[PDB]
Ligand binder design. Structure first.
Ligand SMILES: CN(C)c1ccc(N(Cc2ccn[nH]2)C(=O)Cn2nnc3ccccc32)cc1
Ligand SMILES: CN(C)c1ccc(N(Cc2ccn[nH]2)C(=O)Cn2nnc3ccccc32)cc1
Lengths: 304, 304
């Protein structure tokens, strides 16, 4: 029993972290096979970030200008290319610690672990979700760029995020491992505001099921609702609309607990309208939305 | 910017996890050098746990009864001994992945990361604190015993916890790596209730400093207090008494923010008396106490 904001074991990813320096800018790179992936803004100075022409800045850079260090040893760069907002540095040595991997582009509401790094060295690991406005609420300082987000299924690491920037509002933006930003963000220091940070309804319901499984049941009520009725309430509270796909995805948790999805929706509707009244659920005084239904099943079943 | 419940990178510890089976009981062991450490209740059946005589149960066990598997390969057990509530299985092979390590016995209020394991395989990593009643609020299922808690300072892993049991109340108890339980708990399935789970005052203040550093400042007020006045309020709310040692430990955060420790105590006193009024601090609607002052500085400075 017990329910925690759990991150994937980071070992497979730590073995891929390297330091990339170009000129006076140092950030993190991801070394997989004989390629090192890093944010293309490694070629910029802080002045360049206001209005960078990446293609023009890249012309003044050669293979020997990209310094890649894995631990205390230098990697030889034998090629470089820009793919969207990432640079791919071909090195002469395949990473011997390369795990089985995939590059995936996640959808909002999906969760992943982040291995925060500085100078190619890991500092910490935490769990987060891709918000509905395509930002992440991470913990990143200057030098953290190139730190990655990932999921692990048994032995395969699915890389989904690479860190690029912090918006003036304190939230974070980045790309998938193909260099495409999540959302409308650009790697330019300009006025970029995030849209509404709505709550991931399907995740709140998943976490309510986790609470029931773990003994916190005070919020369970005598009511039911319909998807359309629940959705009117969800709209009022800036919660994402719940779809029949979401209901289907909650099926296994509904089967385990014996609590129909629409009954749990009615419990959630009451919590939204009446609040928690000074009470807590799984040690939180607010409705948690960074656990997917898959995460709840995984944590409550002990998948390694 | 941003402040997250961050765990240490788990790689160094993943390389130490092994599976230990004795009879029909399988749990996790920690392989460091040529010794595998595991809970002594690996020798028990579920029936034995009601009233175990560990010394008597151990007499019926030989080296060949302890099956130790590291990944897919079997380790040869050439000696075994009981040290307090842990077994030390001497194996014929030193773990090649043994990091630099220390065994430390932590004090309540201190935090650490837990690498939850099943069948010698890591499933997740999360951060937690040793509660003032010597329990931990973890996420552990059956088979998780022998999973360990640790801190990492650059390259040295300080192991502080090994998981042994879940109390009937859903909280967790375990030992240091010398086999001594934290608190008064015993490895017996009996009526063991935990004492008052008081709030770690020094950690709440540390987290309030983290909030100020990260931009959440609404709770800062025009007041100050004294240690004795603050402590009267802390007693009323089941918060640990704040000592001059705690004030001293908060010195660096007080210096960074320019907010005197006693002024922050007055802000905390107001939050205790008046509540949050539906507001949040660092994404939480309650006062967080599982970040030490050291953790706040480490996260806000980017220590790898
Ligand atoms: C290449 N250089 C010197 C550089 C310098 C600065 C940035 N920026 C500014 C920026 C680019 C676009 N919009 N905003 C960043 O936001 C990078 N970054 N990422 N997470 C951070 C957390 C704290 C502090 C800085 C952080 C990128 C690149
Ligand atoms: C050796 N065997 C079969 C055994 C079997 C059961 C236990 N116990 C019971 C117990 C011993 C003392 N007080 N309570 C445990 O609490 C072990 N354990 N630890 N975390 C758990 C999380 C969920 C479920 C079980 C969990 C220990 C040992």
């Amino acid at each position: 029993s017990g329910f925690r904001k759990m991150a994937f074991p980071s070992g497979k990813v730590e073995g891929c972290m390297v330091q990339v320096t170009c000129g006076t800018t140092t950030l993190n790179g991801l070394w997989l096979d004989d390629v090192v992936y890093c944010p293309r803004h490694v070629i910029c100075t802080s002045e360049d970030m206001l209005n960078p022409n990446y293609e023009d800045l890249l012309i003044r850079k050669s293979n020997h200008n990209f310094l890649v260090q894995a631990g205390n040893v230098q990697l030889r760069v034998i090629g470089h290319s820009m793919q969207n907002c990432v640079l791919k540095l071909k090195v002469d040595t395949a990473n011997p610690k390369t795990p089985k991997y995939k590059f995936v582009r996640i959808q909002p509401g999906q969760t992943f672990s982040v291995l925060a790094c500085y100078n190619g060295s890991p500092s910490g690991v935490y769990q987060c979700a891709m918000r509905p406005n395509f930002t992440i609420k991470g913990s990143f300082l200057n030098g953290s760029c190139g730190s990655v987000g990932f999921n692990i299924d048994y032995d395969c690491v699915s890389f989904c995020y690479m860190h690029h920037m912090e918006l003036p509002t304190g939230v974070h933006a980045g790309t998938d491992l193909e260099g495409n930003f999540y959302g409308p963000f650009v790697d330019r220091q300009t006025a970029q505001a995030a849209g509404t940070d709505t709550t991931i309804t399907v995740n709140v319901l998943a976490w309510l099921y986790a609470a029931v499984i773990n003994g916190d049941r005070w919020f369970l009520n005598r009511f039911t609702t319909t998807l359309n009725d629940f959705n009117l309430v969800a709209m009022k509270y800036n919660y994402e609309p719940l779809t029949q796909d979401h209901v289907d995805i909650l099926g296994p948790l509904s089967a385990q607990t014996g609590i129909a999805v629409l009954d749990m929706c009615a419990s959630l509707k009451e919590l939204l309208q009446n609040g928690m009244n000074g009470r807590t659920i799984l040690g939180s005084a607010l409705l948690e939305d960074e656990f997917t239904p898959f995460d709840v099943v995984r944590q409550c079943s002990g998948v390694t």
